[PDB]
């Protein structure tokens, strides 16, 4: 130990400044710590988990507190369409007098920030109405954040620490997470909806003071246990219903109308209560599949052992795969992140098309913000999923214990996997760029008729199957003589068909040749990023250039200049490479989303449809066009309320380019520079009275790529965010 970082003796004996740097970036890599055991590993993680939950609870508690104390909300509830939600108050002594004037918006008393996360629509939909509601909610989360720390501390104590085999009790945890964590939680959420949320949308306020001697339904729980549940869908809210009031209010608490509430343009509250109630069943019954202490259930191991196709085309199938996953926390994290990354994108693609919060669709900046938010989160999560996959292969993978099972066969034919991913990327790349450039030349030579505009009829055919009238086609749900139509006839379909064919909402938007090209760009982005990541994973343990890439670990600088040169040959380094491509991919996705939507909100889908087929159009009619109000945030003539976004816009450019230094220039140059400065300090009078305690050295080879990538990423995210918010909110 002796000094920081004392989870690693060998790194504390570093006489340079590298000990501090590396002491921070390895603080959570518990397995690399000194005297680590499997016992301390699971205990440290378990404790960190409570710490994380504590921060989450505390974080949301802050938002609630500040919205209540510095935000209107109550003013917003009366006029959702015509009140800007307030994030919080601005207190900055650097503010000049103009900035204080320009920023005091939303009917506040001083300069404030306008929220674009959409918590206002969420809490209004949820049932929250006044500030008092928000405070008690903030108190409750502050409380939950305390008992998180309290529980984290408790299981670090010797008489409450759980054994490793307790953590490896998979079937018990799954039986409880499915049944309790997913099911009961969802069940009880539908409870909040029919008690507070739904009656709140009908003018009656149901809080803790009066939720006992007040019925959610006239027949009141009678029909549920009777079996005639249909009574709860007997009288839904009217089509002329107004949210928060009794005008048009029904009595139903569980429906399946489909489509949107006309006023709020959001999903019916009675559709969502029903949704979670139905969900909770498949989850409650689902969490009784695996075996515990009652003599019934499944052995997850025994299932995997039993799934070997005869004729051995998958070898030994999934045998031994139970222990391979249950012993390796990285395999579990990889599976967790991949799954979580997919439903993170699923959330993004569903919340813009099928809004669940009242009056959230009208707020275009919030809708743009939230979509871009999750698609980058999902993107980052996806690369991490493909990072611990490699880590698993290096640290936990046991070749003999996975002999000839599906996992081993992956490595066995890794060249085939990688080469085809390379072919798919090359195919998509050559033609998507090819078609874009061809069209740009046609526009250049002033002959747009010569363009190659391929109609996306496959996807148009899908939309027709959903019931979209455009394109014709006479597909299912688009045809009067369709068994699928007459089956759902007058259930969810009238609401659905009405919504899918409304021209305002983002429910299955019309797509054309311009949509065709960007999607292949997207396809290109996905295939390449995966190609990089899985080539990294499958080569983590070695290659022809470096047969023993294991023994060296996940992250190492290289293997020297011999054998041709081996820079960026570690599995950590292709992660590093893949992040760039994932940033490029999500960038294409959010460019696509935001341009399609601003033209829609502007009533000018023509501009997108005619300019998205050639790349000059993207530069001129999307980026150059919408940058107008942004870059005029401050001017030689004045400053606006968009000045902060203009400043951040450059800030992003600065951080981004600053990262280019760490990525382009490498270490040997800076090491030789610093040692000349080491000379200077010692030979300068009055200055050599002061001596450094840590020897100044250049950042390491890997550290450089990390620092560079962080800048590149921070710049990336901060630049687009400055543009996304300003161009949108400047126009709305």
């Amino acid at each position: 130990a002796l000094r920081l970082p004392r989870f690693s003796q060998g790194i504390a004996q570093d006489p340079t400044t590298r000990r501090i740097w590396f002491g921070i970036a390895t603080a959570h890599d518990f397995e690399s710590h000194d005297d680590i055991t499997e016992g301390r590993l699971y205990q440290n993680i378990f404790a960190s988990h409570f710490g994380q939950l504590a921060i989450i609870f505390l974080w949301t508690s802050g938002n609630l507190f500040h919205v209540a104390w510095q935000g209107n909300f109550e003013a917003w509830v009366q006029d959702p369409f015509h009140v800007r939600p307030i994030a919080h108050a601005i207190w900055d002594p650097h503010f000049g007098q103009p900035a204080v004037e320009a920023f005091t918006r939303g009917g506040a008393l001083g300069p404030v920030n306008i929220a674009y996360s959409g918590v206002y629509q969420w809490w209004y939909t949820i049932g929250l109405r006044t500030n008092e509601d928000l405070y008690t909610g903030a108190i409750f989360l502050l409380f939950l954040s305390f008992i998180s720390l309290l529980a984290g501390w408790l299981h670090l104590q010797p008489k409450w620490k759980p054994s490793v085999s307790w953590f490896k009790n998979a079937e018990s945890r799954l039986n409880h997470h499915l049944s309790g964590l997913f099911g009961v939680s969802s069940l009880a959420w539908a409870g909040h909806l029919v008690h507070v949320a739904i009656p709140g949308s009908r003018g009656e306020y149901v809080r803790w003071n009066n939720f006992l001697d007040v019925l959610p339904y006239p027949q009141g729980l009678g029909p549920l246990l009777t079996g005639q549940w249909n009574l709860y869908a007997q009288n839904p809210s009217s089509s002329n219903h107004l949210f928060g009031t009794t005008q048009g209010a029904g009595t139903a608490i569980l429906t399946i109308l489909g489509g949107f509430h006309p006023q709020t343009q959001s999903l019916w509250l009675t559709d969502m209560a029903h949704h979670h109630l139905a969900i909770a069943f498949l989850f409650l019954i689902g969490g009784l599949m695996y075996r515990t202490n009652f003599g019934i259930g499944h052995s997850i191991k025994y299932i995997l052992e039993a799934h070997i196709p005869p004729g051995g085309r998958l070898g030994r199938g999934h045998k031994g795969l139970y222990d391979t996953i249950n012993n390796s926390i990285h395999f579990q994290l990889g599976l967790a992140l991949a799954s979580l990354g997919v439903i993170t994108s699923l959330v993004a693609q569903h919340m813009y098309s099928l809004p669940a919060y009242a009056f959230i669709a009208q707020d275009f900046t919030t809708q743009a913000a939230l979509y871009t938010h999750h698609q980058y989160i999902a993107g980052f999560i996806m690369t991490g999923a493909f990072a611990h996959g490699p880590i698993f292969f290096i640290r936990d993978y046991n070749p003999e214990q996975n002999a000839d099972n599906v996992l081993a066969r992956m490595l066995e034919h890794k060249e085939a996997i990688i080469s085809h991913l390379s072919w798919a990327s090359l195919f998509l790349g050559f033609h998507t760029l090819g078609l874009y450039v061809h069209n740009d030349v046609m526009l250049a030579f002033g002959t747009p008729e010569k363009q190659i505009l391929i109609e996306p009829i496959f996807a148009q055919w899908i939309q027709s199957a959903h019931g979209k009238t455009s394109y014709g086609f006479d597909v299912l749900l688009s045809s009067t003589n369709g068994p699928a139509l007459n089956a759902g006839r007058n259930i969810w379909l009238p609401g659905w068909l009405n919504a899918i064919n409304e021209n305002s909402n983002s429910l299955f938007l019309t797509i054309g040749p311009g949509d065709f090209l960007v999607h292949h760009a997207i396809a290109l982005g996905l295939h390449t990023t995966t190609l990089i990541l899985v080539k990294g994973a499958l080569d983590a343990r070695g290659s022809k250039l470096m047969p023993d890439k294991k023994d060296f670990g996940y992250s190492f600088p290289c293997d020297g200049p011999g054998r041709g040169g081996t820079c960026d040959i570690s599995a950590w380094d292709d992660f590093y490479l893949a992040v760039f491509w994932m940033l490029n991919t999500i960038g294409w996705v959010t460019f696509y989303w935001h341009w399609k939507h601003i033209t829609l909100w502007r009533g000018n889908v023509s501009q997108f449809n005619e300019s998205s087929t050639y790349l000059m159009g993207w530069l001129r009619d999307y980026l150059w066009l919408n940058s107008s109000q942004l870059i005029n945030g401050y001017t030689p003539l004045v400053c606006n309320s968009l000045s902060v976004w203009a400043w951040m816009f450059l800030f992003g450019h600065l951080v981004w380019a600053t990262g280019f230094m760490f990525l382009i220039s490498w270490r040997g140059y800076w090491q030789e520079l610093i040692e000349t400065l080491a000379w200077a300090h010692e030979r300068t009078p009055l200055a050599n009275l002061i001596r450094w305690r840590d020897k100044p050295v250049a950042l390491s080879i890997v550290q450089a790529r990390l620092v560079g990538l962080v800048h590149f990423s921070v710049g990336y995210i901060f630049t687009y965010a400055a543009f996304l918010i300003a161009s949108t909110s400047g126009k709305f």
Partner: peptide, 29 residues
């Protein structure tokens, strides 16, 4: 005016934090 928690977070906490970290980091048990 509670908005005078800003400097505390804004400056005082950071200074204390930095000084402390600096000391812990240079410590030689």
């Amino acid at each position: 005016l509670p908005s005078l928690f800003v400097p505390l977070v804004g400056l005082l906490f950071p200074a204390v934090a930095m000084a402390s970290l600096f000391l812990h980091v240079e410590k030689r048990l």
